[PDB]
Design an enzyme around this catalytic site. Sequence first.
Site, PDB file in Angstrom:
ATOM      1  CG  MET A   1      -1.902  -1.050   1.169  1.00 56.92           C
ATOM      2  SD  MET A   1      -3.172  -1.036   2.544  1.00 56.92           S
ATOM      3  CE  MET A   1      -4.501  -2.163   2.153  1.00 56.92           C
ATOM      4  CG  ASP A   2       0.008   4.130  -3.042  1.00 58.47           C
ATOM      5  OD1 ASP A   2      -1.021   5.008  -2.471  1.00 58.47           O
ATOM      6  OD2 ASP A   2      -0.331   3.371  -3.749  1.00 58.47           O
TER       7      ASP A   2
END
Lengths: 183, 149, 105, 353, 161, 80, 55, 95, 78
Positions: free
Chosen positions: H41-42
């Site tokens: 996840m960014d």
Amino acid sequence: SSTHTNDSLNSSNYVDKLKDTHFVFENDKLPSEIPDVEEVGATTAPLLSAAYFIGAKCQDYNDDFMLCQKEAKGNGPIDCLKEGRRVTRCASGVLKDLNTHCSDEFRLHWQCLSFSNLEYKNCRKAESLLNKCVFEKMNLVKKIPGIPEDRQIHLKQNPVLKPVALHQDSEVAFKKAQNENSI
Amino acid sequence: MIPFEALIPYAIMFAGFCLGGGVMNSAITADITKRARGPNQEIKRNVGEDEGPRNYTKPRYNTDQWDKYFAVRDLRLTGSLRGQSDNAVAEESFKTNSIQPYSNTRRPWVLRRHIIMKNSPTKWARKYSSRRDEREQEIKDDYIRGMGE
Amino acid sequence: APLQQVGRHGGPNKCFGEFQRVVECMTNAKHDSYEPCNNLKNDYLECRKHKVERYKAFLMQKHAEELGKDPEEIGAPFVRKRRFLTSKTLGLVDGDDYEIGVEKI
Amino acid sequence: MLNNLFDFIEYIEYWLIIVAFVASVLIVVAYLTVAERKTMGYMQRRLGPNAVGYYGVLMAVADALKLLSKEIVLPHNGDIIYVMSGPLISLFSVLLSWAVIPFGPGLSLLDSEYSIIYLLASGSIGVFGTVIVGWMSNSKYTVLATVRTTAQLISYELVLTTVVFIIALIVSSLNINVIIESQYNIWYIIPFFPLCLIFFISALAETARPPFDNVEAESELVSGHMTELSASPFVIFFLSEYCSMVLMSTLTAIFFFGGYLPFSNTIHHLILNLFDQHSIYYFIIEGILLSGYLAIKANFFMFSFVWIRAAAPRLRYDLLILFCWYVLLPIVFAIVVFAPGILYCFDALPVII
Amino acid sequence: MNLEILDLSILGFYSLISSNSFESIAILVATIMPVITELWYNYSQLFALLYTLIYVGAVVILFVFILSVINEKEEYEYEYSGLFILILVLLLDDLDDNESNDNDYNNVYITDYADWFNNYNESDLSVIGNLLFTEYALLLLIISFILLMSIIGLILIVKKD
Amino acid sequence: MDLILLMLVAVGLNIIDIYIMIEILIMGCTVNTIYSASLDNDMIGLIYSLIQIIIAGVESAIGLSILVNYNRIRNSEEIE
Amino acid sequence: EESSESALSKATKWYLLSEIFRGLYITLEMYFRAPYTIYYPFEKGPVSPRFRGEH
Amino acid sequence: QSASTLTKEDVLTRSVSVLRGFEVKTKDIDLQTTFVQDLGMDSLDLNDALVALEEEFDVVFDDKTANEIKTVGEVVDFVLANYLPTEQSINHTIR
Amino acid sequence: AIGDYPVYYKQPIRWLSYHAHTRPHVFYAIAVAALGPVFMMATPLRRKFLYDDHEPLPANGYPLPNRSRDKTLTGYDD
Ligand SMILES: CCCCCCCCCCCCCCCCCC(=O)OC[C@H](COP(=O)(O)OCCN)OC(=O)CCCCCCCCCCCCCCCCC
Ligand SMILES: CCCCCCCCCCCC(=O)OC[C@H](COP(=O)(O)OCC[N+](C)(C)C)OC(=O)CCCCCCCCCCC
Ligand SMILES: CCCCCCCCCCCC(=O)OC[C@H](COP(=O)(O)OCC[N+](C)(C)C)OC(=O)CCCCCCCCCCC
């Protein structure tokens, strides 16, 4: 007082509908062992006009009938039938005399009462003519017990409360007696 | 400077009260007087030649229980609740035309049909418990059983 | 002694006399027990509810039903509408069957 | 015909009397709206309605008919309950109150020894009609009016009820017609001038009229509880509000100015002496005079209802709450003690005759 | 045709289906009105007007309290009920409407015989006032004592300071 | 239908609905008192009926005030 | 303690609404004065040669 | 009445279900599963998951906690410690 | 003490002046209420100086003479 009861006519037919009132008649007369009497036929207005004349003429019979009721110890309706018939005949006699000696003055008075909500204060002129005629032909005088003779409201010269609308027949008859009787 | 155009609506409002007063004072008085003439329509409507000038009876107000008794008594004498008669002796029909109102003495419908108002410990006992009725039926049964002696 | 059973005009009502005679019997010193006053208590309760008299009426109606008697032959005539207490029913000599005025006395 | 018609009219006669009675009240209410606009106009140096019917006599008809030909706005057609329950309750409350208003001696539809109680009780029902409009409403201005409406009721109801009770206590009767007849020698304006002012102030508060027009303040709550009303619901509420104005103006004439009693007894006798009491024409004129006496006194206070609107600014409702409880209630409660003390002192306790 | 039965049936139907608090105070009004009207006819006109004078004022104060408490709870809460079962419940309650089981007392009518001994006739309210201020004046004074307690009681409960 | 406690469904699901139920229940007793007093022609019962109306009105005021303060306490932060 | 008018005098004005009746009387005076209304379109308001209207 | 009824296992079970509605790299999620590495996840994807987890448990992560949370277990611990039932009206409790 | 609040038991007249000036809705409401009982206490003065009380009304039923029945009463017989 307009409280609904089970002893007389109520205010409206909706009261009868809720009470399921039945206006019941009886087709049987009094038994023959009780002597028959002639009932008084005067309506509300003539009775109120002759109330003080019945009392003056039939005072001893009114008291005797009412004294019978108190001394009967609950058996008043049955025991005092004899005393009741004396009052009915005596009261009828007063009305009969009023129709033979003072019919014009008598009819003028109770027709004024029907014209003025059956209030004594609104028919002083007609009552004064009636009171004078009865005294001169029957020797009966209206009297209000418990107060001095000169402090009777029907003899008051300038009452505070007076009828709003004059009764024309009373006014004409009163003037016909003022000029003629009192020259 | 009196503006008469502003007073026009007040004059119409003045006539509005007079319309009610004129109709009510006259129509009600005439109806009472008409019904006091006699027990049949041939006397209420038709005026006799030898009859005198009509005397009107005004509406009655501020009454009590005595006036309710008088109204029924006048009905049995003249056929009208405000009939007029100064006869010394009443008719023979007056003896046996007495009116006695018979009616039920049950509780109001709201007391016995409202979804909430009819529920109480005593009302349930009256409605569902025979303890009161069984005991009171003894008094009714004692009446018949005490006749023969 | 507080007042009970007061009529709508300030005086005693129909059943005060029955109640008064009950109180006099119960408070009278000559009595040894309340048994002599038992009959007076029944009269006071009969004055209010008329339960015994209604029961007597129930028997008479039920008894007439088994005998085949018609209710209108042994009962009392009645009128259900006040406007129809006509002068013909009242027995007036010139009595008509037209309805009476009950709108405004 | 003929015979079957001359008794059919007698059978339906009393319904015509009621219909005429209803028309009599409606005409006064209808032209009170025209009179108010005409009266304010000249006080404001304008003219008021004069171009709808000859000199403006059809102004009331046009306003009613145009609104009766307007779309009814509601979330759904089945929602006719919501926007009509309020106005109908308010209208029925004031129309039923007119039953005990006697235009003459005994000339009232309902006669009872408890007419005063029926009058106050019927008027209190009309308050419930106003609060119905704010029925969890999504309109914020409708909601604010309901809160103000309840606040005004707490103000006048205690004051208005007690003032009427003092007049009833003075006559020892709760019958309106008995109260009117008791003023034959003295009009209650003279002995109870403070109460007449207090009664009129309470009447203004009850009808939500200025300076107590906080329920329908245009500069505060656009239209109050009527902001969401249109067509018939608006008319019924408008009719009920003006019917209360006529009723309260008539009540002021009854309690303090003798009701239908003549201004001059001598003039009343002279006019009626021109007519024969053996003919119906006397009683037609008599009803006109007696109601004319009531109309003149009632029109003056209907003028005064318009007069105060054109002369006084609006008072805040929170100031009105303090006005009635701190000032009016102590004064009226003081009088309800003062009056029996005077009557008992001079052996003049009232009785009904 | 006793139309009081129909009015109470309608009132009872809405009592079982009432959801929000506004419908409950409407039930109260729909209850006092049949009581007042049934009192106005038949038994007592005096207390029919007394009920209107006192309870209508209480209704408005009750209503204004609702506006300060409604918290969206019943505007989205679901109810299930069912039309068939609601009618069945009301139908069964309609079957039994005999509050008393004295058949003679309920089916036999009675009358009273009026008398002329009471020449001084006044309303029931005057007789109530005559006894309340003379015979039972202690009750009247204690009622005022209770009213005094309520005035003090309301202030101490509600007032913040 | 009363013995299965049917009235417990006719009462709404709010605290103020319980208050309304009590007023109706007390009103039923007063109606019964007026019913008995009117038949008996007894003004003593009408005195009782008037007392029940006045006393029940006092009860409503006290209960409402408690409910008003109870609702006030929850919304009493008033930081704004 | 420094009021010029007595308490009874200040109460009489306050209880009897002295200034309110004064305001009512002034408003009633205009009721008996000539209004300003003109009956357009049968009558027209004043115009000047400098007036700007249709081109 | 107004008390938490959560358990570590139920909170973890519902946390996994929410995170499996996204495009995470692995469907095997436990307490030690990291958002940045294991889930991939960014910045914005992580904040989408955090708000989605807020909706499930009716809780609101503060700024400091949300800007420093690394593993799913820290999310589970925050929910257990801070969750409260929403206050009901007066009628719900006393009636 | 140009505008101090007077002490009632030390300056009763000044204390009444404060409320008559600052609380007119209280001072005069009590003044009107006080005259009620005051006139009630002046009733004996009217009883001796102006006029006497009226005779009580016959609102107690039919006035029964306080005597035994007249057994020698006849007339209007059957
Ligand atoms: C009086 C004439 C003018 C009023 C007429 C209005 C008729 C509507 C029904 C009147 C009340 C009859 C008895 C019902 C008790 C109250 C129940 C109620 O809440 O009102 C019924 C109304 C119908 O709408 P509905 O959607 O079916 O109900 C909500 C369903 N969740 O649901 C609503 O909430 C709408 C409420 C609108 C405002 C009504 C306020 C009460 C009105 C009482 C005045 C009449 C007194 C009662 C008379 C009948 C007695 C049974
Ligand atoms: C009769 C029944 C109807 C009128 C009832 C009300 C009248 C006023 C009561 C308080 C008066 C007061 O308090 O008087 C005092 C005040 C002001 O005077 P001041 O400041 O002391 O003057 C200073 C000292 N001088 C007197 C030496 C100069 O006077 C007024 O403003 C009077 C108002 C008159 C105009 C309105 C009268 C008509 C009202 C409308 C028709 C109903
Ligand atoms: C014993 C004799 C009893 C008299 C009965 C009548 C009393 C009337 C009220 C007097 C007190 C008062 O108007 O008070 C004013 C109050 C409260 O004012 P406040 O906040 O106390 O400030 C003032 C006190 N100062 C100066 C000490 C700070 O508000 C108002 O402006 C109310 C305005 C109502 C106007 C309604 C008029 C409608 C038209 C009426 C004419 C037809």
